[PDB]
RNA sequence: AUCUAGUCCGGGGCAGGCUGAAGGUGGGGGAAACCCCACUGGAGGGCCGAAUAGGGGUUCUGACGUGCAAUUCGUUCCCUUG
RNA sequence: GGUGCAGAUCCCGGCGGUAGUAACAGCGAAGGGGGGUGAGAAUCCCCCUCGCCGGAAGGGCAAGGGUUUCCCGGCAACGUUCGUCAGCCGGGAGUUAGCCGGUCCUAAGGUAGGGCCUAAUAGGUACCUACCGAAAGGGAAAGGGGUUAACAUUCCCCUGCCUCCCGGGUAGGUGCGGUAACGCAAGCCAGACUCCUGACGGAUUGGGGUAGGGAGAGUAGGACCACCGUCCUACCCAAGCACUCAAGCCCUUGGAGAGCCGUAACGGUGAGAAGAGGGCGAAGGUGUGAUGGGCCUUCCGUUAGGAGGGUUCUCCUGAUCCCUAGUCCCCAUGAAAAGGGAGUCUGGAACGAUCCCGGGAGACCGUACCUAGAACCGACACUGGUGCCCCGGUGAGAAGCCCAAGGCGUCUGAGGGGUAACCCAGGCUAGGGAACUCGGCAAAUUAGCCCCGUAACUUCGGGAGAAGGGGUGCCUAUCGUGGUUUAACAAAGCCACGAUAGGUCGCAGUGACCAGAGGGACCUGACUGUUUAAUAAAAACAUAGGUCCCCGCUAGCCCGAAAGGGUGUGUACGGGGGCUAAAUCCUGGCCACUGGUGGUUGGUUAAAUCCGGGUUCAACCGGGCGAAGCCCCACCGAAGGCCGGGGGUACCCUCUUAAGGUAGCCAAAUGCCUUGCCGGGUAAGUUCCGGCGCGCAUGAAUGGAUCAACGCGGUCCCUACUGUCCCAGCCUGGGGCCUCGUGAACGCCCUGAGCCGGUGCACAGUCCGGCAUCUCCCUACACCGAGAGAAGACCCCGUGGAGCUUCA
RNA sequence: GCCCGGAUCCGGGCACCA
């Protein structure tokens, strides 16, 4: 047979790369080591990211972008560090917060920029404490474990209700993926030939075998439901 | 159409221009390479042992 | 070498007693000087494609006159 | 017409000339009829770039 | 059909109804949190709003402030 | 990868008309909620439309079929703010 | 010994027959008279006239070509014919820049050297440094009039401008006005930091201009004059410099509401409206440039030239070109740099400009010509493709028709013909009106604009231009509304649109041109979109909506030999992977099999290690320990899927193998029998519609039922209409026919080929027996030559292949 | 051919190039 589409998508040709030069910049925390203060100077649109970003100016003259928090205005003053209080937009440390506090853009280590709860409308809560680490419940309902001194922002990422309006036509979804790396439109595998897909071929379009496949299948075969524990709607 | 109408679009700038080293019109312009002597990423003259029958 | 928007077409015949018609190509108009975060160009400041070498003709005569009005300034002194 | 001076600045076998035998050579060699074996035409033949 | 009458007879009655209820929430008369309902608030992009009197820009939801 | 397939960067285009979404104003009613009419407004993968503006390639199974042409020509048609 | 040819769809060379035959028509153009040159004119040159294009056949310039450009002289070949002609042949020539472009900057992207990798490199490359990457992006500064056979924002004349450097002054160092917004000749040289032009989408609308186009008056010139006196041409001005500006945004005063102000529209206002004053401020305009030109024209000499006249005034219309503001939209938010200007500080000297005057300098490379029914690519002077930018009447119009400016009759073979048959395009037909045919294919009908009027159905938006009815010319006068002019309204001059009254002609008034036939019913895909370049445009693909699976980031999925890499400048409202296919009403039962996931008392389980035997040591025999997997158990059907039979009285029991087809739908694009049976429609119905349901072999995201809107999708019926037919006839353009010029190709053992009956591998031009038959030429027809064209694609064989699949 | 379990046979997982 021939290489599948997902196998071509891994060579990273220009058809499958992200057009990142169109974004404001990486939206990460900077490496700072004090108790500073900042001012929001702008709220911008980041093309293919789903959440608006804020631009922050530190008292020592440092510029950086972080995902915007719902309810933060331009010209507002925020504090960064271990002594920061519990207010929207403040960058705090997770070791200092009580139980059930809603945060976002949570780091795993000290100084990685933020990993979890970054997409629009998402947030995390503080759910306990291990010996050396705090337990945080993510939006997937799973639990992750992070350092004592990992930074996070207080509040919820702006842009909720994003998905309550139907796109309503094939062209509204044509722009959406012009600024992203996602391949669109998507051809069903049953509509291909046997040389291009394990589902292709036959008089009647059908998945010829059960769709569930094991975790040990070689590349070029992991299609359908991957290592599923269950199927069906209920 | 495959034939006569598509040969009309063969009047743009060519794929191969003159090469300084060999004096042949084999320098692939878009790749920075002579397809006859290798000038562009070979210091040695491009030469292969299949280049004539034995 | 046909049309390009980076040039405006002009044709001249009103203030005109000779008799012919032609077309002149000039570059689009400039704007008050640029980078951006504070975003307000000013009142009394001059921008021309060439420079008449002017000095006080192209700027007001206040303290920060050419820089900006008293808006984005007093946190600088 | 924009020539990058490798064809118009150097002139010779690179954008120059396609000429008949000089008339005095035809007389000197007494040739029955004397031609230039490399004659070409702009419209029929092809010149390398 | 209200605001959704610009689609005609396409996309289905229930799909047009959901689109129309979201847009009718966006175009409600909103009140500015900072000054008051004085100048009306408008959307710049998804999640970006400002009031046209006080010129204050803030971050909110995708279709409401 | 001068053809063609997809993509990214920088450019150039689509004569002329029609319909009339939300919103706005003024009359007329009923206590009310709210309804009717006229006008204004200018939305939409809306509509009609230039041999040769651009793009396509359905019919005649038309002409040609040692061609104008190793895929063209005529008629009848399709699209044209995305 | 490279040694003898008739065959190899033999190789190469020369030459026949077809045959002086086809073709030199078709894609909407056309020539005629008079004269000239020349050995020789349908074809070259001059004059008159006639025809065609006129959103291209005219004008301007790319990539590409490469001398094709211009002058002189030619005609052996070259051009579909001829040629005295030419994009051909011979001989001479031609491209001029501080201001145009390259050159410079960066974009998507790439490369070299280092590192890391590689057995090695001419191999890979996430990192560092440097460089490259646009003759339509960014990017200091020029216009007019003229000049050659051929170049001209490049040469001459006039008037300029930019950058840098000199010399002389001056403003500053040490100066002023305003409440303010701001106004200005304001020092110099060396740094640092910062800010703002550069520098950005789509849609829609107002305002202001300009190119262009018109009417009237006048002066010159021209055209017509059967009679009228009208018609055509000319009347006009660059950059730079001085002055001026609407929108918008700012500054003082002022102090408003149950209201005021204002737009085309949205609107504005105590966080300060209207009213009064002001500041910054487009495109353009008006002066100067310019008693300079260039445009029209008269007279004399008709060589060289010379001498005069005019170039004014009042209005209208007007961009798709220009600049200026609004408003709206996005699960679109719509490049970066060099290079510019300014500001704030620090240091240094006392001389000194961003202002006037004079002087000097500004490398290098491109520049001719075509830019296409003859200069580019397609073997060709190829009806294809490659181009982009621009251009009075009728009319909504860049449409169709007619004509200016400009161009052409070279989409380069002609002549004769009462013009045969026939073919390719076109016009019309009495009576009938689909009787033609697989099928109304083709052709016909209708058609613009205004007013009235408009059904079932429906997702309430549509259907819908449904269907249907009435009006329309010309002339003679009017009225209303609006624009514009130093212009509230009213008057005056121009201009546009909408109506009214009367008169009148024809077969016909959207009189040509342009320009929808309509209705009823079923299937199918929801819709706009995509596809087999060169026989398939579809019901196939996509789609929005729905639903399921993997994954907390040092993840999940994928690429690499490694170094490493794509998603990723990303973080579950996400990235990756399946199936279904808008909306509405719904989506049943089954975990036995296969597959996936998890678990485990327990069995089996490789290498290595450990123990015993053996071997003066080993090989070699045993035993123990023994991971994942498998055996075993459980769960999962919007996982693959499956949904029967028998016996008894809708009910109960049994077997395959777990259950035994629920809601719905149907003789279906799915029903073998089969033209199923009954009804509808027709005089007559194997198709169609409705109903039934012995369903060979319908059925639920493997999606079931269901059609509003949509379709260059499939089918049936009706009305209208017609040469589709009964059944053909006449007319027209281009060919054919006759003549001149150019000039091929296929068939070909042979030239010996009339036919009928036979023989024979079973259908003879040639053999046997008969009957026939004087020779040549022209047109027409294609029945025969098992006619010509291609080592049959069907089928079988070969211990021939290639791509796909899996339980080989 | 073995292990192992079950009544010489049976079952389960592995050994087995004429």
Curated annotation (Swiss-Prot), chain A:
Keywords: Ribonucleoprotein, Ribosomal protein, RNA-binding, rRNA-binding. Residues 197-234 are annotated as: Disordered. The keyword rRNA-binding applies. Transmembrane segments: none annotated. GO terms for molecular function: rRNA binding; structural constituent of ribosome. Residues 205-215 have a biased composition (Polar residues). GO terms for cellular component: cytosolic large ribosomal subunit. Residues 222-234 have a biased composition (Basic residues). One of its GO terms (biological process) is cytoplasmic translation. InterPro entries: NA-bd_OB-fold (IPR012340), Rib_uL2_dom2 (IPR014722), Ribosomal_uL2 (IPR002171), Ribosomal_uL2_arc_euk (IPR023672), Ribosomal_uL2_C (IPR022669), Ribosomal_uL2_dom3 (IPR014726), Ribosomal_uL2_RNA-bd_dom (IPR022666), Translation_prot_SH3-like_sf (IPR008991). Belongs to the universal ribosomal protein uL2 family. One of the primary rRNA binding proteins. Required for association of the 30S and 50S subunits to form the 70S ribosome, for tRNA binding and peptide bond formation. It has been suggested to have peptidyltransferase activity; this is somewhat controversial. Makes several contacts with the 16S rRNA in the 70S ribosome. Part of the 50S ribosomal subunit. Forms a bridge to the 30S subunit in the 70S ribosome. This is Large ribosomal subunit protein uL2. It comes from Sulfolobus acidocaldarius (strain ATCC 33909 / DSM 639 / JCM 8929 / NBRC 15157 / NCIMB 11770). The lineage of its organism: Archaea, Thermoproteota, Thermoprotei, Sulfolobales, Sulfolobaceae. The gene is rpl2.
Curated annotation (Swiss-Prot), chain B:
One of its GO terms (biological process) is translation. GO terms for cellular component: cytosolic large ribosomal subunit. Binds 1 zinc ion per subunit. The keyword Metal-binding applies. Disulfide bonds: none annotated. A zinc finger (C4-type) spans 19-37. InterPro entries: Ribosomal_eL37, Ribosomal_eL37/eL43, Ribosomal_eL37_CS, Ribosomal_zn-bd. Keywords: Metal-binding, Ribonucleoprotein, Ribosomal protein, RNA-binding, rRNA-binding, Zinc, Zinc-finger. Zn(2+) binds at residues 19, 22, 34, 37. Its cofactor is Zn(2+). Pfam families: Ribosomal_L37e. One of its GO terms (molecular function) is zinc ion binding. SUPFAM superfamilies: Zn-binding ribosomal proteins. Binds to the 23S rRNA. Belongs to the eukaryotic ribosomal protein eL37 family. PANTHER family: 60S RIBOSOMAL PROTEIN L37 (PTHR10768), RIBOSOMAL PROTEIN L37 (PTHR10768:SF0). This is Large ribosomal subunit protein eL37. The gene is rpl37e.
Swiss-Prot record, chain C:
Pfam families: Ribosomal_L34e (PF01199). One of its GO terms (cellular component) is ribonucleoprotein complex. GO terms for molecular function: structural constituent of ribosome. The keyword Ribosomal protein applies. Keywords: Ribonucleoprotein, Ribosomal protein. GO terms for biological process: translation. The keyword Cell inner membrane does not apply. It comes from the Archaea. Gene3D superfamilies: 6.20.340.10. Transmembrane segments: none annotated. NCBIfam families: PRK04059.1 (NF003143). Belongs to the eukaryotic ribosomal protein eL34 family. This is Large ribosomal subunit protein eL34. It comes from Sulfolobus acidocaldarius (strain ATCC 33909 / DSM 639 / JCM 8929 / NBRC 15157 / NCIMB 11770). The gene is rpl34e.
UniProtKB/Swiss-Prot annotation, chain D:
Pfam families: Ribosomal_L39. Keywords: Ribonucleoprotein, Ribosomal protein. The lineage of its organism: Archaea, Thermoproteota, Thermoprotei, Sulfolobales, Sulfolobaceae. GO terms for cellular component: cytosolic large ribosomal subunit. InterPro entries: Ribosomal_eL39, Ribosomal_eL39_CS, Ribosomal_eL39_dom_sf. HAMAP family: Ribosomal_eL39 (MF_00629). Binds specifically to a region in 26S rRNA near the subunit interface. It comes from Sulfolobus acidocaldarius (strain ATCC 33909 / DSM 639 / JCM 8929 / NBRC 15157 / NCIMB 11770). GO terms for molecular function: structural constituent of ribosome. It comes from the Archaea. This is Large ribosomal subunit protein eL39. The keyword Metal-binding does not apply.
């Amino acid at each position: 047979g021939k290489k599948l589409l997902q196998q071509r998508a891994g060579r990273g040709g220009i058809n499958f790369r992200s057009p990142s030069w169109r974004r404001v910049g990486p939206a990460r925390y900077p490496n700072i080591e004090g108790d500073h203060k900042g001012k929001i100077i702008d709220i911008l649109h980041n093309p293919g990211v789903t959440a608006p970003v804020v631009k922050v100016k530190l008292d020592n003259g440092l510029q950086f972008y972080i995902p915007a928090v719902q309810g933060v205005a331009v010209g507002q003053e925020i504090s960064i560090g271990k002594n920061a209080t519990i207010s929207n937009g403040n960058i705090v440390e997770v070791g200092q917060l009580p139980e059930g506090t809603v945060i976002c853009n949570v780091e795993k280590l000290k100084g990685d920029g933020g990993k979890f709860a970054r997409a629009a409308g998402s947030y995390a809560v503080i759910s306990g404490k291990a010996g050396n680490k705090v337990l945080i419940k993510l939006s997937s309902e799973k639990i992750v474990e992070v350092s004592q001194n990992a930074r996070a922002t207080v509040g919820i990422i702006a842009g909720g209700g994003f998905v309550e309006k139907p796109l309503l036509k094939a062209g509204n979804n044509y722009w959406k993926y012009r600024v992203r790396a996602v391949k669109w439109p998507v051809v069903r595998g049953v509509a291909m030939n046997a040389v291009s897909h394990p589902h292709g071929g036959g008089l009647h379009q059908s998945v010829s075998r059960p769709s569930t496949v094991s975790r040990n299948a070689p590349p070029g075969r992991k299609v359908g439901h991957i290592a599923s524990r269950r199927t069906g709607r209920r | 159409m495959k034939g006569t109408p598509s040969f009309g679009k063969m009047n743009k700038t060519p794929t191969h221009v003159r090469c300084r080293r060999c004096g042949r019109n084999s320098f692939n312009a878009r790749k920075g390479y002579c397809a006859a002597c290798g000038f562009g990423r070979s210091k040695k003259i491009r030469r292969y042992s299949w280049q004539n029958k034995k | 070498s046909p049309q390009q928007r980076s040039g405006s077409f002009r044709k001249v015949f009103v203030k005109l007693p000779s008799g012919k018609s032609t077309i002149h190509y000039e570059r689009r108009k400039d704007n008050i000087a640029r980078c951006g975060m504070c975003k307000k160009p000013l009142n009394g400041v001059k921008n021309n494609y060439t420079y008449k070498y002017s000095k006080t003709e192209k700027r007001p005569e206040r303290v920060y006159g050419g820089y900006l009005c008293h808006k984005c300034l007093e946190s600088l002194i | 017409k924009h020539k990058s001076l490798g064809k118009k600045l150097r002139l010779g076998k690179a954008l120059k000339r396609n000429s008949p035998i000089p008339a005095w050579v035809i007389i000197k060699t007494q040739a029955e009829i004397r031609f230039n074996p490399l004659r070409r035409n702009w419209r029929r033949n092809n010149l390398k770039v | 059909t209200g605001i959704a009458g610009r689609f005609g007879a396409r996309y289905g009655s229930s799909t047009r109804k959901k689109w129309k209820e979201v847009m009718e929430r966006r175009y409600m008369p909103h009140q500015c949190p900072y000054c008051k309902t004085t100048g009306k608030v408008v959307r710049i992009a998804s999640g970006i709003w400002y009031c046209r009197k006080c010129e204050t820009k803030w971050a909110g939801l995708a279709y409401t402030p």
